[PDB]
């Protein structure tokens, strides 16, 4: 029923008289009932990684043996809720304790059981109807944006013997009650699910729809997709500065789950202050991002066990909202801090490490976390397709590319927005290094582009070719000299400068460049590549001819055209509507064609 | 309160470096405090690092020399280390264990606070947006500090990091559009360094507002494990209870990490990098993360650790983890120190992660962020041009490359360079930055918006 503490060493308690305890089962250690997890068994003695400070835990202290593993309460109240790494509600703790401190062993319910929720059952349901895991048997009007579809827990099934009528219910009220094999199971609106178990789905479908970040470089050169899997450096200036809040403010995603695995104190404070104040335009109204975002905060000084469970809690919440039928963009602030937690716990366990001290199962754990992403035909009879798009941040020691966690990540993730330290130093934001950064979803996105942006794929191909040619030419230019360059080489270099400075360079703090629509991105790239092709055509055609044309001639003739192409990035979608921006870009193309016709 | 008589054990079973392993212990309490009376009456203190049934691995702060089994009396206080804290701790000097060394009386406790500290709910932690006008241009201009922020001073052996810290201490103050109370924690600082800091505080008159915790080099090497926690508990008392804007200086997190490594090696734990404990990240975070403000309160705890990077290596575990935790770093450069620049702050590798929200209109000025960004960019390009010149020669440099080199020279001569007793307001720092940026034409200042170039460049 309950064991006794035999020894203590930091977070690693060792409790005796735990004969039947199960691995990874939950226990409450001490007289304050500190949450712990059984990570090892030796006869009748269980090693317990404790999720709170173990100071003052004495040998012989009772150890309650709870039968469940680390699990999260999934139900109404998640949206707009700030959570500790193990689902403890920080805001509710503050309100209940009336103090700024997290009391040790605090046991406040993750989901409030006093808030009345507007519950409306699925009308077609009735007493005796057959239901299974995933069946949306009711909807809670959580807020103006998210309709919380109350799903029957996975691995549940049977005949509905009672469905509550429409009304207002608590998170603890028995709302449904179904019989199977003669056993009656009573279900409220909150379901407990282990954080380390993948939520089942009918089928993981391929990802074939872009997840539009705000950045032109990421959207065009290295696309991401819904249900995707991305690695993004945690370098300053980029990352939390712009990309996370842009995904929050606007994207194809319908929910956001942001897990601060190892966040610094004041930076986590920055997130918790900014996010409740961000707003987005939905159905002609400005609504708080908190109405569809949830935060799983975990500062660096919180227990390492909670730091390890933070990622799992976040991904389980994301999977729940995916099963709901939504697109959940999840952002892990640092999987590097998760790996550090794993390394420290492995050391405390006295396991043999792999290279650089990390456990040899770091890659397996990273895969078990990432591969929980994807676009899925959610379980449950009412057909729906959800997705979970993970954006995990990796911050190796001193920008190391051979870092074990970065290598394990690159072995799993399909998108990687590598960091250019040179660009970061020059203050070229985003600092993506387009030469080693990659996205494997380009092939899957061919169908989407060839139906909505038919012309964008050749533009992307030509832009990448131009950038690589610039990379190859800059070495020669700075090794030897700029005098021997051909006219076509000059076109490539100057078009590469144009693209890099005014298509791949996006300042995320300006009103006009906070979020760049993909129509804007594709139109800009189209203008730039059209200019490239036409200038190269002029140069090559006039080569071996009396009236030779050169890059200097072109620039001197149409410095105005170059300036307009440079200022193209300033179009503001908010006031310069889509039609206005497209018309302006078409006018720029017309001016380019007219000027080159005059030149020719 | 604990009324039960304490238990005294003459059952010492083993001494191994700083560890004293007792047996036959009645219900050992982890992290409990013990008082070891040696055979000759010398009294020491220890902390139970781990317990296993009837065993207890005490860790003696003063060192285990002179201890013998069968005669050392370890009295178990029955409670975790609860340091006494009082406002009159300001203007006092304490050794690493908190005992007076200024010939004053023992601290008359206003309260007894756990040294490990009370974790702070992130939901009620204020984001520090108030700038600290340190008066050092290399920091204010480009790596500004926000009140409540954690920002270490990475340096090496022989660099003037003590001088920079003393300058920051004596010049720290808010930007003019509440004086700081200093809590000092010296770990392994030689007598010269400790005397320098104490004399500086006395000369500048802040001693009434300064609370020192000195653990010199000759002092026990395991006492610096608790010294920073004592300092931060006192800082939390003065800030979140007495409503004082505190500034916490920690001289040698390198020495603290060496103490951690020593204890871990004595414990024969599975090592991390370079032999440091695998939990060094968490141990360092439990110290750094105690800065910042909180809702309802009026005080704050600005934290400025100081590190000695071994072999000037910013990839060493101590600086690496301290960067992972703290919000930025101020980097002291051996090349600059050799070239006789002061402060030798290399602004390329150093950053401040709260500077973006500390600077700007209303806080300091409209052009602060753009000026800093352009200064950093021009400095980096100048360093690259210098590296190229070292190989190809100046005669192959273009006019713009020569402009970058001139900017680098004047930037290290006018912006970074600064008298030890000279505090430049943020506005003066920005004026110097603009004078240096005017070297380049407006067309070469790419990171400065035209709306600000047309307002500040022409002057």
């Amino acid at each position: 029923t309950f064991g006794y503490v035999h020894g203590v060493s930091g977070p690693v308690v060792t409790a005796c008289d735990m004969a039947g305890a199960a691995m990874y089962e939950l226990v409450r250690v001490g007289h304050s009932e500190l949450v712990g997890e059984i990570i090892r068994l030796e006869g009748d003695m269980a090693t317990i990684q404790v999720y709170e400070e173990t100071s003052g835990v004495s040998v012989g202290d009772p150890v309650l043996r709870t039968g469940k593993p680390l699990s999260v309460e999934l139900g109404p109240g998640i949206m707009g809720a700030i959570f500790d790494g193990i689902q403890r509600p920080l805001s509710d703790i503050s309100s209940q304790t009336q103090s700024i401190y997290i009391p040790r062993g605090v046991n406040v319910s993750a989901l409030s059981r006093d808030i009345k929720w507007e519950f409306i059952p699925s009308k077609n349901l009735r007493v005796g109807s057959h239901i299974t895991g995933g069946d949306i048997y009711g909807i809670v009007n959580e807020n103006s944006l998210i309709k919380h579809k109350i799903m029957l827990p996975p691995r549940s099934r049977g005949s509905v013997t009672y469905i509550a009528p429409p009304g207002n219910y608590d998170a603890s009220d028995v709302v449904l009650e179904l019989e199977f094999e003669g056993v009656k199971e009573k279900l409220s609106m909150v379901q407990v699910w282990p954080v380390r178990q993948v939520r089942p789905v009918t089928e993981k479908l391929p990802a074939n729809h872009p997840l539009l970040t705000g950045q032109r470089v990421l959207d065009a050169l290295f696309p991401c997709v819904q249900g995707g899997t991305t690695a993004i450096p945690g370098a300053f200036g980029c990352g939390k500065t712009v990309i996370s809040q842009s995904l929050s403010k606007y994207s194809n995603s319908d929910v956001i789950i942001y897990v601060g695995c190892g966040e610094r104190g004041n930076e986590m404070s920055e997130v918790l202050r900014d996010f409740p104040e961000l707003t987005m335009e939905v159905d002609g109204k400005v609504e708080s991002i908190m109405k569809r975002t949830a935060l799983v905060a975990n500062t660096s000084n919180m227990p390492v066990a909670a730091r390890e469970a933070s990622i799992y809690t976040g991904i389980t919440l994301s999977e729940y909202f995916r099963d709901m039928g939504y697109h959940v963009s999840m952002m892990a602030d640092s999987t590097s801090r998760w790996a550090e937690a794993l390394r420290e716990i492995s050391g405390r366990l006295a396991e043999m490490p792999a290279d650089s001290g990390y456990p040899a199962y770091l890659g397996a754990r990273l895969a078990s976390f990432y591969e929980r992403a994807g676009r899925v035909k959610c379980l449950g009879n009412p057909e729906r397709e959800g997705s979970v798009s993970i954006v995990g941040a990796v911050s190796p020691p001193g920008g190391d590319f051979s870092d074990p966690v970065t290598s394990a990540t690159l072995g799993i993730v399909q998108v990687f927005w590598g960091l250019d330290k040179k660009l970061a130093q020059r203050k070229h934001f985003p600092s993506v290094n387009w030469l080693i950064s990659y996205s494997k979803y380009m092939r899957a996105l061919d169908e989407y582009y060839d139906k909505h942006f038919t012309e964008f794929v050749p533009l992307r191909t030509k832009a990448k070719e131009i950038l690589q040619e610039e990379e190859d030419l800059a070495e020669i230019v700075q090794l030897v000299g700029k005098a021997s360059l051909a006219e076509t080489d000059k076109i490539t270099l100057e078009v590469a400068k144009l693209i890099k400075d005014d298509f791949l360079q996006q300042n995320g703090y300006t009103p006009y460049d906070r979020f760049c629509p993909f129509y804007k991105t594709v139109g800009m790239l189209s203008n730039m590549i059209s200019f490239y092709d036409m200038a190269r055509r002029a140069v090559e055609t006039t080569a071996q001819s009396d009236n030779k044309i050169t890059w200097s001639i072109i620039r001197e003739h149409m410095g105005e055209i170059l300036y307009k192409l440079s200022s193209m990035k300033f179009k503001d979608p908010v006031k310069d509507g889509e039609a206005k921006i497209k018309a302006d870009y078409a006018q720029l193309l017309e001016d380019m064609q007219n000027a080159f016709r005059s030149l020719e | 309160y604990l009324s039960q008589p304490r238990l005294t054990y003459k059952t010492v079973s083993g001494v191994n470096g700083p560890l004293v392993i007792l047996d036959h212990v009645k219900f050992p309490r982890y992290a409990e405090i013990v008082h070891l009376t040696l055979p000759d009456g010398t009294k020491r203190s220890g902390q139970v690092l781990e317990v296993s049934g009837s065993k207890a691995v005490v860790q003696v702060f003063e060192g285990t020399s002179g201890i013998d089994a069968k005669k050392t009396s370890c009295e178990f206080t029955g409670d975790i280390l609860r340091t006494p804290v009082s406002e009159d701790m300001l203007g006092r000097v304490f050794n690493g264990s908190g005992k007076p060394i200024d010939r004053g009386p023992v601290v008359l406790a206003e309260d007894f606070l756990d040294i490990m500290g009370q974790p702070i709910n992130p939901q009620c932690r204020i984001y520090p947006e108030e700038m600290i006008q340190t008066g050092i241009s290399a920091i204010d201009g480009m790596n500004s500090i926000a009140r409540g922020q954690k920002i270490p001073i990475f340096s090496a052996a022989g660099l003037p990091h003590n001088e920079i810290a003393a300058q920051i201490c004596r010049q720290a103050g808010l930007v003019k559009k509440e004086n700081f109370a200093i809590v000092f924690a010296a770990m392994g600082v030689n007598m010269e360094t400790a005397r320098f800091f104490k004399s500086d505080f006395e000369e500048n008159g802040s001693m009434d507002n300064v609370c020192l915790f000195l653990n010199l080099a000759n002092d026990p090497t395991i006492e610096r494990i608790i010294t920073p926690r004592l300092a931060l508990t006192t800082a939390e008392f003065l800030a979140y209870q007495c409503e004082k804007h505190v500034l916490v200086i920690l001289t040698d997190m390198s020495s603290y990490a060496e103490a951690l490594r020593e204890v871990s090696a004595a414990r024969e734990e599975v090592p991390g990098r370079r032999g440091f404990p695998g939990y060094m990240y968490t141990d360092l975070a439990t110290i750094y993360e105690r800065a910042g403000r909180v809702e309802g309160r009026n005080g704050s705890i600005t934290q400025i650790p100081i590190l000695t990077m071994p072999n000037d290596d910013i990839t060493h575990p101590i600086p690496d983890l301290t960067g992972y935790i703290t919000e930025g770093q101020i980097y002291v450069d051996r090349q600059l120190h050799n070239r006789q620049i002061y402060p030798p702050i290399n602004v390329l590798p150093s950053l401040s992660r709260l500077m973006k929200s500390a600077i700007g209109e209303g806080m300091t000025r409209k052009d602060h962020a753009d000026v800093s960004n352009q200064l950093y960019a021009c400095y980096a390009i100048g360093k690259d041009v210098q590296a190229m010149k070292a190989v190809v020669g100046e005669e192959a440099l273009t006019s713009d490359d020569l402009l970058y080199l001139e900017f680098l020279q004047k930037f290290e001569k006018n912006f970074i360079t600064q008298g030890p007793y000279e505090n430049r307001t943020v506005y003066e720092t920005l004026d110097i930055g603009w004078q240096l940026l005017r070297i380049f034409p407006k067309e070469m200042l790419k990171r400065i918006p035209q709306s600000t170039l047309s307002e500040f460049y022409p002057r």
């Binding site: 006295a350 043999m352 490490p353 | 024969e268 599975v270 090592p271 032999g275």
Partner: peptide, 19 residues
Amino acid sequence: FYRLKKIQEKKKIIKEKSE
């Protein structure tokens, strides 16, 4: 490698002590 080998030897010795 030396540190890990030393740790393995100590773990073996501790296991023998417990046995």
